[PDB]
Design a binder for this molecule. Structure first.
Ligand SMILES: *[C@@H]1O[C@H](CO)[C@@H](O[C@@H]2O[C@H](CO)[C@@H](O)[C@H](O)[C@H]2NC(C)=O)[C@H](O)[C@H]1NC(C)=O
Ligand SMILES: *[C@@H]1O[C@H](CO)[C@@H](O[C@@H]2O[C@H](CO)[C@@H](O)[C@H](O)[C@H]2NC(C)=O)[C@H](O)[C@H]1NC(C)=O
Ligand SMILES: *[C@@H]1O[C@H](CO)[C@@H](O[C@@H]2O[C@H](CO)[C@@H](O)[C@H](O)[C@H]2NC(C)=O)[C@H](O)[C@H]1NC(C)=O
Ligand SMILES: *[C@@H]1O[C@H](CO)[C@@H](O)[C@H](O)[C@H]1NC(C)=O
Ligand SMILES: *[C@@H]1O[C@H](CO)[C@@H](O)[C@H](O)[C@H]1NC(C)=O
Ligand SMILES: *[C@@H]1O[C@H](CO)[C@@H](O)[C@H](O)[C@H]1NC(C)=O
Ligand SMILES: *[C@@H]1O[C@H](CO)[C@@H](O)[C@H](O)[C@H]1NC(C)=O
Ligand SMILES: *[C@@H]1O[C@H](CO)[C@@H](O)[C@H](O)[C@H]1NC(C)=O
Ligand SMILES: *[C@@H]1O[C@H](CO)[C@@H](O)[C@H](O)[C@H]1NC(C)=O
Lengths: 49, 116, 49, 146, 98, 98, 49
């Protein structure tokens, strides 16, 4: 009898759920190449271990 | 509309009967509500004057110094050919002001032309 | 190809034109609360008061 | 209840749209009215300029950027030792094709002879790790010689 | 629609928005970044682009010695923007969502 | 939990996020800021730090003549970051609150 | 009513989290992928990396 209230609720929650993955993608997926450090960690004394 | 001999009512909105078959004469007539719309009062400060203009929003100037703007019918303001900065926003590029002393309605100016 | 005495220097360039799309404004909506709830009914509007 | 729900969602959506519009105004100021050094703020690459275009309910920025294209390997040194002096590039980087040393601007290969107008002297040759022996030419010596 | 719901027109028409964008484009093309900070100072466009090359750490002779190639690259990039815009129907997703 | 409430997993796993962060770290370490603007251009890390010293208005010889001291300072600072984060948990409250 | 309250609170919290995520993405672009001259945007002092 209440109509489409909770369909609205599920739509809002789904929007939030998608936005979470969008947030993570925008933060961390800022490069399409997967770069790797050389096996010899010689950087002139700088230590990134 | 083509109401087949079994169809009595008509609903393209599904909650309001927008059409109906008259029982006496089987002519089918559509039902459109009479009219409605907002009413806005354009005024300068009462610390300046008591004159007002009235905007009947989104209605033609027949349902109601009569100026048909894209925002509706304006009554009590004279339309001027000049362009100024917006003072009271009316809508769709039209603005209103109070100048010597009457309320004027005009197309707003975006700025002075300048060729480099 | 990292090393302690190697560098990569570009010898050319590309002029790149990219598109960024940003929403600015929404449709301006107005609702007549009484008309939506209690359309042209005076008993309903009196109750809504 | 339905009307209140609609108005609440409209308020939240309007807040999001206001954030987007503030970002658009900032980009109009910093990318169209100027050249931005902020990485990725205007486009991908080194920002040169931006052009705005109106769109229904929004804006489209055409970001013109500079992208290095065809890189080449060279050998580097942090400084050059000539007469017990350590020479450092005023602008650019010391670069070597295998046999000869040059100084280049950092973003575009343009080899130039290492000269005293090209470099500046700081200290002796015993402090810098990886300093490379090479000659630094003085343009004044031929002029006062001839 | 007929239940007390109305749509108010924007104050600025689409033509006025186009006029503002055209004014911004003309100012940028004819005066670079000067009109933003004050009076518009005219400068030939290749010299403005040389300014911008200096701004990204590249010497001006790189632009001047490659002016035709750079102009061709820019023109073709704008043309590719045109082509892609009229080829990807999901390009304007951010606006259509609104 | 038991009343129609479900928790959806993130699209990217923690391992994938770690992979992205490791790729960013490797790119920065091996190529400085070049991989963010285009192709990754290798450069010795002391030379990159000299570039950054120039970026903050300090001459390159200041870095090169103090390379061991600067590297020791950086290493000690990173070690202290590890120590401090492992010492007190309230530093991560911003995340915990979420 | 309880479900509506929860969903509205989730929407507001999601807006705040989205603002935080946008700031984090901007800092990833400008502090990690480049050297920023914006005072205090990438730590206290003159930003190196
Ligand atoms: C970089 O620093 C780490 C410490 O943070 C060094 O790791 C230590 O190495 C020594 C010698 O191999 C070991 O005795 C220690 O147990 C290690 N400590 C830890 C916490 O792993 C590492 O050796 C350094 N790298 C270089 C190249 O010197
Ligand atoms: C490195 O660069 C130097 C200078 O550009 C090269 O030396 C020149 O080589 C050309 C051959 O094409 C000669 O005509 C010039 O007379 C040389 N100049 C000098 C000053 O000797 C050198 O060959 C390059 N080395 C490599 C491996 O490419
Ligand atoms: C750069 O040239 C100098 C000479 O100007 C070299 O100095 C010699 O260094 C060796 C040790 O490597 C000493 O045994 C000699 O007595 C030094 N001679 C002179 C005249 O100074 C220096 O070694 C060279 N550097 C490199 C890396 O080859
Ligand atoms: C009902 O009566 C009226 C009046 O005589 C007539 O016009 C109409 O046709 C009648 N309805 C039908 C369905 O015949
Ligand atoms: C108002 O009605 C007149 C009647 O001829 C018509 O010409 C005009 O276009 C109408 N204006 C609007 C805004 O509907
Ligand atoms: C504007 O000027 C034209 C003639 O150029 C005239 O026909 C028109 O009526 C004027 N508009 C107003 C509002 O007076
Ligand atoms: C740079 O690339 C362009 C193509 O965009 C090419 O025409 C030109 O010859 C290249 N320059 C060099 C020096 O290779
Ligand atoms: C530089 O040398 C490495 C090998 O160590 C090679 O993989 C890389 O492609 C070279 N770079 C260029 C631009 O040729
Ligand atoms: C670079 O590394 C090599 C070993 O591969 C070493 O012989 C050389 O001395 C190092 N040079 C510098 C400047 O670190």
């Amino acid at each position: 009898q209440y109509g489409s209230f909770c369909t609205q609720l599920n739509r809002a929650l789904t929007g939030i759920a998608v936005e979470q993955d969008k947030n993570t993608q925008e933060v961390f997926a800022q490069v399409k190449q997967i770069y790797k450090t050389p096996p010899i960690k010689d950087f002139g004394g700088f230590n990134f271990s | 509309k083509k109401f087949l001999p079994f169809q009595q009512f008509g609903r393209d909105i599904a909650d309001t009967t927008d059409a109906v078959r008259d029982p006496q004469t089987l002519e089918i007539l559509d039902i459109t509500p009479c009219s409605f719309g907002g009413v806005s009062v354009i005024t300068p400060g009462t610390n300046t004057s008591n004159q007002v203009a009235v905007l009947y929003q989104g209605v033609n100037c027949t349902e109601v110094n009569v100026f048909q703007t894209r925002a509706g019918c304006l009554i009590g303001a004279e339309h001027v050919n000049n362009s100024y900065e917006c003072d009271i926003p009316i809508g769709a590029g039209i603005c209103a002001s109070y100048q010597t002393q009457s309320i004027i309605a005009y197309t707003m100016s975006l700025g002075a032309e300048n060729s480099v | 190809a990292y090393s302690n005495n190697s560098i990569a220097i570009p010898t050319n360039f590309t002029i790149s034109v990219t598109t960024e799309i940003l929403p600015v404004s929404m449709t301006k909506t107005s609702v007549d609360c009484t008309m939506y709830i209690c359309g042209d009914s005076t008993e309903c509007s009196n109750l809504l008061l | 209840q339905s009307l209140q729900t609609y108005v609440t969602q409209q308020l939240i959506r309007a807040a999001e749209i206001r954030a987007s519009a503030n970002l658009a105004a900032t980009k109009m100021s910093e990318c169209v009215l100027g050249q931005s050094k902020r990485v990725d703020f205007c486009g991908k690459g080194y920002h040169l300029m931006s052009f705005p275009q109106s769109a229904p309910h929004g804006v489209v920025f055409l970001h013109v950027t500079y992208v290095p294209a065809q890189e080449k390997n060279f050998t580097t040194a942090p400084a050059i030792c000539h007469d017990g002096k350590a020479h450092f590039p005023r602008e650019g980087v010391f670069v070597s094709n295998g046999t000869h040393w040059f100084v280049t601007q950092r973003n575009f290969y343009e080899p130039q002879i290492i000269t005293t107008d090209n470099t500046f002297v700081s200290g002796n040759c015993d402090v810098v790790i990886g300093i490379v022996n090479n000659t630094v030419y003085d343009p004044l010596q031929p002029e006062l010689d001839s | 629609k007929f239940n007390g719901l109305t749509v108010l027109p924007p104050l600025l028409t689409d033509e006025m928005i186009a006029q503002y964008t055209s004014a911004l484009l003309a100012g940028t093309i004819t005066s670079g970044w000067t009109f933003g900070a004050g009076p518009a100072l005219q400068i030939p466009f290749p010299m403005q682009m040389a300014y911008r090359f200096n701004g990204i750490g590249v010497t001006q002779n790189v632009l001047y010695e490659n002016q035709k190639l750079i102009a061709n690259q820019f023109n073709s990039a704008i043309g590719k923007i045109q082509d892609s815009l009229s080829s990807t129907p999901s390009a304007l997703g951010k606006l259509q969502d609104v």
